[PDB]
C-alpha cells in the first residue's frame, strides 16, 4: 500500500510528456502495456540498486553518480522494489541538484496515477463531464440535452 524507500532496476527516462499537474496522462489497458510504453523511452541512466532520500520532509530524491550535465534531459523515473515483486513504481523528475562534480541529486515525485493505475476501483460517482456515445446503430443521434449553459 505504501511506496517503498528503496528501488531496484531503476531507470531515468527522457521524453515523458505529462506532468504533476495531472491534467493529462497516458492511459493503459494492462500493467504490461504500461511497462512496454515506458520501456520504449530513451534511458538517461540506470542503476541496479538505490536507496531513496528525503521521504520524511516529503521531497524524495535519489543520488545519481553522474555529472549534472548528463541529466539535463531527465523527465521521469521507474523502479521496482525487492518487496513488491514485479511491480513498477513511476515518478516525475522535478529537479536536478548539484552536490559535487560526479554526483547529482535527482528530485522526484511519485506519479500516483501511473503507479496505482490498476489498483484503483472506481465506484459510482457524480459525473460532471465525460465523453459519451454519440450515435445509435441506425445512425440517429443519442439524446443528450443537459443544459450546457453555453451561448
Amino acid at each position: 500500500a505504501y511506496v517503498p524507500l528503496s528501488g531496484t532496476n531503476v531507470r531515468i527516462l527522457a521524453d515523458v510528456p505529462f506532468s504533476n499537474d495531472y491534467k493529462n496522462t497516458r492511459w493503459f489497458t494492462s500493467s504490461s502495456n504500461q511497462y512496454n510504453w515506458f520501456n520504449s523511452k530513451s534511458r538517461v541512466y540506470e542503476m541496479s540498486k538505490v536507496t531513496f532520500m528525503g521521504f520524511r520532509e516529503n521531497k524524495p530524491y535519489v543520488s545519481v553518480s553522474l555529472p549534472i550535465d548528463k541529466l539535463y534531459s531527465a523527465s521521469y523515473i521507474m523502479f521496482q522494489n525487492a518487496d513488491y515483486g514485479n511491480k513498477w513504481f513511476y515518478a516525475f523528475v522535478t529537479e536536478l541538484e548539484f552536490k559535487n562534480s560526479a554526483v547529482t541529486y535527482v528530485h522526484f515525485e511519485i506519479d500516483v496515477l501511473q503507479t496505482w493505475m490498476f489498483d484503483i476501483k472506481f465506484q459510482e460517482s457524480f459525473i460532471v463531464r465525460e465523453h459519451v456515445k454519440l450515435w445509435n446503430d441506425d445512425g440517429t443521434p443519442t439524446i443528450n440535452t443537459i443544459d450546457e449553459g453555453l451561448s
Binding site: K121, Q123, E124, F126, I143
Partner: protein, 94 residues
C-alpha cells in the same frame, strides 16, 4: 372527431432526467430541512447523512466530540454491509 367529456392525461419526466435524478437520490437521499434525530441505520446497505449545526453529546473528550460533529455536518455515508462502495444494490428500507 370524437372529442367529448373530460380527459385525464398523465405526464412524467424524460428517461434522461429520470436516470440523472434517480441515481443522485439513490446515493445521497433527499433534501430534508427538518430538525430531527438523523436516520443512521434505516436502509439495508447504506445511509447518507448530512447535517448542519448538529447536536451530539456523550462521555467523550470535547475535542473528539467537536470532530465527530464536523464529520456529520460535512456529510458521510454509513455502510451497513461489507461491500463498501457498491452502489448497485437496491438499498431498500430495513
Amino acid at each position: 372527431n370524437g372529442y367529448r367529456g373530460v380527459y385525464v392525461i398523465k405526464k412524467q419526466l424524460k428517461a434522461e432526467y429520470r436516470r440523472s435524478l434517480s441515481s443522485f437520490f439513490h446515493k445521497y437521499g433527499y433534501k430534508i430541512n427538518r430538525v430531527k434525530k438523523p436516520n443512521l441505520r434505516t436502509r439495508k446497505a447504506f445511509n447518507y447523512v448530512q447535517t448542519k449545526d448538529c447536536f451530539i453529546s456523550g462521555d467523550i473528550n470535547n475535542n473528539d466530540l467537536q470532530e465527530i460533529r464536523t464529520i456529520f455536518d460535512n456529510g458521510i455515508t454509513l455502510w451497513h454491509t461489507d461491500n463498501i462502495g457498491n452502489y448497485s444494490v437496491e438499498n431498500e428500507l430495513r
